[PDB]
């Protein structure tokens, strides 16, 4: 029978809008006494109410800032600003697009074998480091890169301990000069200053020790576990590139230097940037290395010379995830392993709302790369650079708040971009502006006359 | 099955001395069994680390032991227009200790040595040395077969052939029953590894103090090679003797090369001329197959069986994941002139990083059933990680997969309980062979007695 508009007090145009979004008000003075002023728009038009006299606000969303999504400032969210205008208890829907434009963050830490056997491979590792720095920068603007060096445990019989001059200059008995021996030395923390990195890499020169197998595994362990020192970022892909031309010492080798304490897997670098446990603790085992590489979420890449590729290919199979590349005068082989790694990176768009008013509540529909509207979902996963996802948000206001103007932010997690939605609450009628304070028709000390009615 | 874990005996050495890094039973001329203990980081009389040796007499209560004194003074000799130098600082005296008849051989694998001639030198390097002692007489002798008087240059000119400068002689050691002392020198021939043999009697009769470079005419050293498979192989990291050719007149040597062929590892069986009779290859790289070797007849057929330990072996587990547990390999010797085949049994540790098979000790017939038994060490085994020694009884079929008994470390974390082991000797004279376990981290030794 009757509707909710007519059967709920409704003494005014304002009270009429408070009942429900479908109600309309007739201001037409020519309307008869019998006809209700607060009704459906269908009913008012059917009761000879002049179309120009009907008050019936409809909610809208206007795009204010609408810059396009970027290609290759950077715009990833679109539109950037929307103006919502709601009436009591009403809702309204709007659209949003998100695209992964920015490059993925990648960490590359470079371990340089600076033992004497690398005297002839020095140019090659310098060339490799600087090519990794330069070429991967072209691939990702969020690259960070650092490096350190290793020789072996500075203890006899690995270290030359005679004559006394040999300690400052291991190359002494060859009537030449090289640097003192060292276990592991952290040289440059993960930085985005590529030119600086390249310059420091080119300054590096070789040292010398006695036995062919070196202590690079100590470096690998310390480069993994020393979080602060190396500076691996949390939300970033981690690559540890390891160079050498020879065999490597493994757990239980240390007994030939009198070292019997097993590797504790803890960081022992600190102030002087040297591995302080080098002379007192054994080399790590493959399993302990695997545990920490896994725990700290780091991918090891053996960049070894051709003569030991097979050896490291075999170790690689005992440390799952590890890959191997050929160190040489040409850097293509190793670079490809990094490019391939970057190729496998995938990201997600997870919308989060900030500063949502009590009175407002949202609902979302996600349209991901599968091109299917998954309703009540606000995140898409499995995105590469250039991929675009799309959401449809609906916002409902609870009644009419006296705040009248508010704003909230829909923002993807990890993205600096966002959507500012400015919300206005239209609870009044245009005819209320023409108040006319003088009663005129009431004349009982009532006051005012708006939209064709007394108090 | 029947080693008493309740009634233990603890012997202790000084703090930080690594008392119990090596040990053996020693039997005096009267027959009285004692325990010789190596303590390679014992402070010398001038507060510098030289290492030391202790000779413990059997007591139920145990306690402190007397030090078996050795010369800890460095030596210099200006002879033949050269300058010979010995360096006993950080030499690790007692890193290995073995007993034969009334003689104790205690070695310092990191004793350094140099020779100076004008502005040139041989290089100050760890040749190693062994100190021989006969307690009931007081006699002392030494044996240091890798010392040379060749200058640095000549090695360079000969592409580093026959380079014994880094031997670390006495790193491992064993004596035959006849009295031939065999030493492992895994740093020999530029880290290839070598063995040095010499009669104990001849070592004593050719040694005088102060000479430093002398001849032991009866000695026999192994050979240098240009075979890349042997490079950095540490041939002689472990060593043992046994009977594997069926001829009782000859003796066969078992040598462990744990990083042989690019860290694959290997154990070899040789004649006394160092000719290869068989080679056992490792299963998995970096597992240190050859860290430990044991020789004993476990299946009661009279033929010695071989036991190799690979304490860093990683076992396969769910979802392609490897887990470092350790593994021991049993090889039964077949009849006639036949080679040692594949392993008759594989024993694999259960605790991660436990280093199962870090030491393997023949116990003799522990339960007196006819079959010999063994103990295997997992120095960081057990749920806690404190350490664990596991007894395995022998049978016709070889050995049992399930251990008959498990001894848990009574010492705190880090002790390395089980790093050294010895058995097959009745210390309390009750007719059953007993077991001694060293825990060098804790500076102690624990004796377990076999009961009926």
């Amino acid at each position: 029978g009757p509707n909710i508009c007519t059967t709920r007090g409704v003494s005014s145009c304002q009270q009429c809008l408070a009942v429900s979004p479908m109600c309309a008000w007739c201001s037409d003075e020519a309307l008869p006494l019998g006809s209700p002023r607060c009704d459906l728009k269908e009913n008012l038009l059917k009761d000879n109410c002049a179309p120009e006299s009907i008050e019936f606000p409809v909610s809208e969303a206007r795009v204010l800032e609408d810059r396009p999504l970027s290609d290759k400032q950077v715009t990833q969210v679109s539109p950037q600003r929307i103006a919502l205008r709601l009436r009591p208890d009403d809702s309204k829907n709007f659209s949003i697009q998100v695209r992964q434009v920015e490059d993925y963050p990648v960490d590359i830490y470079y371990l340089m074998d600076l033992s004497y056997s690398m005297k002839d491979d020095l140019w090659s590792i310098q060339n490799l480091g600087t090519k990794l720095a330069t070429q991967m920068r072209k691939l990702t603007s969020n690259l960070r890169i650092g490096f350190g060096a290793f020789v072996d445990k500075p203890v006899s019989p690995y270290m030359y301990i005679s004559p006394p001059e040999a300690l400052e200059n291991p190359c002494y008995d060859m009537k030449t000069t090289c640097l003192p021996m060292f276990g592991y030395k952290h040289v440059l923390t993960l930085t985005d200053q590529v030119t600086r990195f390249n310059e420091e890499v080119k300054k590096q020169s070789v040292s010398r020790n006695r036995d062919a197998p070196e202590g690079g595994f100590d470096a690998i362990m310390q480069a993994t576990v020393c979080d602060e020192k190396i500076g691996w970022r949390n939300d970033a892909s981690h690559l540890l590139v390891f160079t050498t031309d020879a065999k490597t010492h493994i757990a239980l080798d240390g007994r030939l230097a009198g070292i019997v304490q097993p590797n504790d897997g803890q960081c022992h670098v600190g102030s002087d940037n040297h591995y302080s446990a080098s002379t007192t603790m054994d080399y790590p085992s493959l399993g302990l290395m695997t545990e920490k590489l896994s725990q700290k979420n780091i991918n090891l890449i053996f960049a070894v010379t051709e003569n030991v590729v097979n050896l490291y290919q075999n170790y690689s199979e005992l440390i799952p995830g590890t890959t191997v590349g050929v160190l040489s005068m040409d850097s293509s082989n190793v670079l490809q392993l990094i490019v391939d790694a970057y190729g496998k990176i995938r990201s997600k768009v997870e919308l989060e709302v900030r500063d949502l008013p009590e009175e407002l509540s949202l609902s979302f529909n996600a349209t991901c790369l599968n091109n299917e509207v998954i309703p009540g979902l606000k995140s898409c996963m499995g995105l590469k650079i250039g991929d675009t996802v799309s959401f449809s948000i609906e916002a409902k206001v609870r009644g009419c708040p006296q705040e009248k103007e508010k704003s909230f932010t829909i923002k993807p997690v990890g993205f600096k971009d966002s959507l500012i939605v400015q919300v206005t609450f239209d609870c009044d009628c245009a005819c209320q502006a023409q108040a006319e304070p003088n009663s005129h028709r009431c004349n009982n000390g009532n006051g005012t006359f708006e939209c064709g009615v007394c108090r | 099955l029947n080693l008493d874990p309740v009634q233990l005996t603890f012997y202790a050495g000084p703090n930080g001395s690594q008392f119990g890094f090596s040990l053996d039973f020693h039997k005096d001329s009267h027959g009285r069994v004692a325990i010789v203990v190596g303590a390679p980081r014992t402070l010398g009389p001038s507060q510098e680390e030289t290492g030391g040796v202790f000779l413990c007499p059997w007591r139920a209560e145990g306690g402190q032991c007397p030090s078996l004194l050795f010369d800890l003074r460095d030596e210099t000799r200006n002879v033949g227009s050269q300058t010979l130098q010995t360096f006993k600082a950080r030499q690790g005296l007692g890193a290995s200790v073995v007993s034969w008849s009334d003689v104790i051989v205690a070695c310092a694998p990191w004793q350094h040595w140099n020779v100076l001639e004008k502005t040139e030198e041989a290089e100050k390097t760890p040749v190693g040395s062994c100190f021989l002692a006969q307690p009931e007489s007081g006699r002392r002798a030494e044996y240091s077969p890798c010392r040379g008087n060749t200058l640095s240059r000549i090695y360079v000119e000969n592409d580093f052939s026959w380079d014994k400068r880094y031997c670390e002689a006495g790193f491992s050691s064993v004596v035959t029953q006849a009295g031939e002392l065999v030493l492992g020198a895994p740093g020999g021939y530029y880290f290839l590894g070598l063995l040095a043999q010499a009669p104990v009697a001849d070592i004593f009769s050719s040694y005088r103090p102060g000479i430093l470079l002398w001849h032991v005419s009866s000695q026999s050293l192994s050979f240098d090679s240009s075979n890349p498979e042997y490079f950095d192989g540490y041939w002689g990291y472990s060593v043992a003797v046994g009977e594997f050719d069926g001829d009782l007149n000859t003796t066969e040597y078992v040598v462990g090369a744990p990083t042989w062929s690019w860290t694959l590892g290997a154990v070899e069986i040789l004649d006394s001329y160092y000719q290869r009779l068989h080679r056992l290859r490792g299963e998995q790289m970096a597992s240190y197959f050859g860290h430990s070797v044991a020789v004993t007849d476990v299946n009661g057929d009279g033929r010695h069986d071989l036991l190799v330990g690979a304490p860093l072996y990683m076992e396969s587990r769910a979802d392609r994941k490897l887990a470092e547990v350790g593994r021991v390999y049993l090889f039964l010797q077949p009849r006639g002139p036949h080679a040692l085949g594949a392993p008759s049994l594989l024993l694999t540790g259960t605790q991660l990083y436990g280093r199962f098979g870090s030491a393997i000790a023949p116990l003799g017939d522990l339960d007196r059933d006819g079959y010999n038994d063994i103990a295997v060490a997992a120095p960081y085994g057990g749920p806690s990680g404190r350490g664990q020694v596991l007894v395995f009884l022998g049978q016709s079929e070889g050995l049992r997969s399930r251990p008959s008994q498990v001894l848990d470390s009574p010492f705190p974390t880090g002790s390395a309980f089980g790093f050294s082991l010895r058995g097959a000797v009745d210390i309390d004279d009750n007719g059953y062979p007993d077991l001694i376990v060293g825990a060098y981290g804790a500076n102690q030794v624990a004796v377990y007695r076999a009961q009926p």
């Binding site: 072996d152 070196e214 | 580093f160």
Partner: peptide
Amino acid sequence: XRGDWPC
């Protein structure tokens, strides 16, 4: 390489 040097 035999030792720590180029081949």
